Amino acid sequence: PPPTSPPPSPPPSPPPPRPPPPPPPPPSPPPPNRSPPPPPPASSAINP
Numbered sequence: 001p002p003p004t005s006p007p008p009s010p011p012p013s014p015p016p017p018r019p020p021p022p023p024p025p026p027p028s029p030p031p032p033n034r035s036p037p038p039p040p041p042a043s044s045a046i047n048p
């Protein structure tokens, strides 16, 4: 007899485990230091 046909081929292997997740970004930098107010106008003279 002719050589018997080979057994069926196995189904495709499963995909490797999917990668882990990224890490949360470092704390966002604080706001800019707001500048101070301006000095009051030159005051008048004290009462006599």
Ligand SMILES: *[C@H]1O[C@H](CO)[C@H](O)[C@H](O)[C@H]1O
Pocket (backbone or CB within 6 Å): 002, 003, 004, 005, 006
């Ligand atoms: C698979 O091939 C063989 C020959 O190698 C044979 O013809 C079988 O009948 C067939 O199923």
Ligand SMILES: *[C@H]1O[C@H](CO)[C@H](O)[C@H](O)[C@H]1O
Pocket (backbone or CB within 6 Å): 006, 007, 008, 009, 010
């Ligand atoms: C798929 O694999 C089988 C053996 O498992 C055989 O070689 C077939 O010829 C091939 O198509």
Ligand SMILES: *[C@H]1O[C@H](CO)[C@H](O)[C@H](O)[C@H]1O
Pocket (backbone or CB within 6 Å): 010, 011, 012, 013, 014
């Ligand atoms: C991955 O699995 C299939 C069967 O699901 C087969 O065995 C391969 O040889 C293997 O790499």
Ligand SMILES: *[C@H]1O[C@H](CO)[C@H](O)[C@H](O)[C@H]1O
Pocket (backbone or CB within 6 Å): 025, 026, 027, 028, 029
């Ligand atoms: C402030 O910066 C961090 C990273 O430095 C992150 O992107 C925040 O989303 C942002 O608000």
Ligand SMILES: *[C@H]1O[C@H](CO)[C@H](O)[C@H](O)[C@H]1O
Pocket (backbone or CB within 6 Å): 033, 034, 035, 036
């Ligand atoms: C006033 O000072 C702050 C820093 O405290 C900053 O440089 C502002 O740009 C400036 O106007």
